[model samples]
Target: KETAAAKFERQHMDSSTSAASSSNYCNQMMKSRNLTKDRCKPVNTAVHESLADVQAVCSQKNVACKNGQTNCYQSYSTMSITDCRETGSSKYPNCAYKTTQANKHIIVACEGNPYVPVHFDASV
Candidate 1:
């Protein structure tokens, strides 16, 4: 079984692609990375930064998780991220996404013994 931390990495981490020069990045990545399985994810984000740096956010500041939990943390610095929003024309199975790049502070939920990021809460 895939762990929560590993799943977060699969869905959010994209260190190789620092800049999304083309608009089709989300359209391709959302599916290629299996985020479109079964149904299309309405909104998703891919961080263009180092995994180590992202993990370090847990040690930054505590924040409320999207679900109202207190296990979330906000990044101290804005990170390069690509927001993938589902296009209105997008239908099930065949998902279409609009990619927008920006530098924003990310919020994530952390857990476990080592206290690493386990879920992507949101981008602020």
Candidate 2:
């Protein structure tokens, strides 16, 4: 297993940091209407994803520098951003990068009777 620091060094480090911002659609829904506690409870959810492409970052860096003429010390600059919205709710849950696993699966609270629209995207 690799530490988060190691993962960022190999797959997420970049000379320039990018900004990612979004609005509070879920909050709007909650404020506009009254919801019962039973309808707003959360459930546990999990998922797993793995493939050859999962390690492509390390492999690509190795293959590109395999040629003796090229510099092996330099790895391509990298940036990875992941965002997700809650199911059955207008809220978008905040997420952090995970290093050990092939993919990230988060457990969040899911609620009912959403009254707002939500938008999610990646920005450079």
Candidate 3:
């Protein structure tokens, strides 16, 4: 049961943060139930790197790499990993920040429930 003022504040703040982290909007459910501790913990930081960044790293490491895709059961889960890569065959290559050379990586997630998270990594 939130007062109108409290609801407004939460909604306003949540809007901005939601793009950066969808979990920000879930505060309402937590507050309504008076639950402590954020249930949604970021498995990895959002990937904001570029092809150049990955190429430099992969080349230095001498590893073969490509972009990756994975699926999970939920929107939020702590028991997951993040290991993304760049590939030419990627449908979401633009958002994926395309790269080649095997040493590139990015963070991807499925934030929801019944958490089933996946991770990709290069073992070079």
Off by over 4 Å in 3: 1-20, 24-46, 62-124
Per-residue alpha-carbon lDDT of model 2 for 47-76, expressed as tens digits? 121222222223233221333332122113
Best by lDDT: 1
Model 2 worst lDDT run, 10 consecutive residues: 115-124
Q: Which candidate is the best by TM-score?
A: 1
- TM-score head-to-head 1 vs 3, winner: 1
> What are the TM-scores, per candidate, against the unseen true structure?
0.94, 0.17, 0.19
Q: Candidate 3, residue 101: CA error in Å?
A: 24
Clashing pairs in 2: none
Q: lDDT tens string, model 3, 47-74?
A: 2233233222322322222453343112
Clashes of each: 0, 0, 18
Query: Best to worst by TM-score, what's the order?
Result: 1, 3, 2
TM-score of candidate 2 against the unseen true structure: 0.17
- Alpha-carbon runs more than 4 Å astray in model 1: 18-21
Global lDDT scores for all candidate models: 0.91, 0.24, 0.27
Each prediction's RMSD to truth: 1.2, 18.2, 18.7
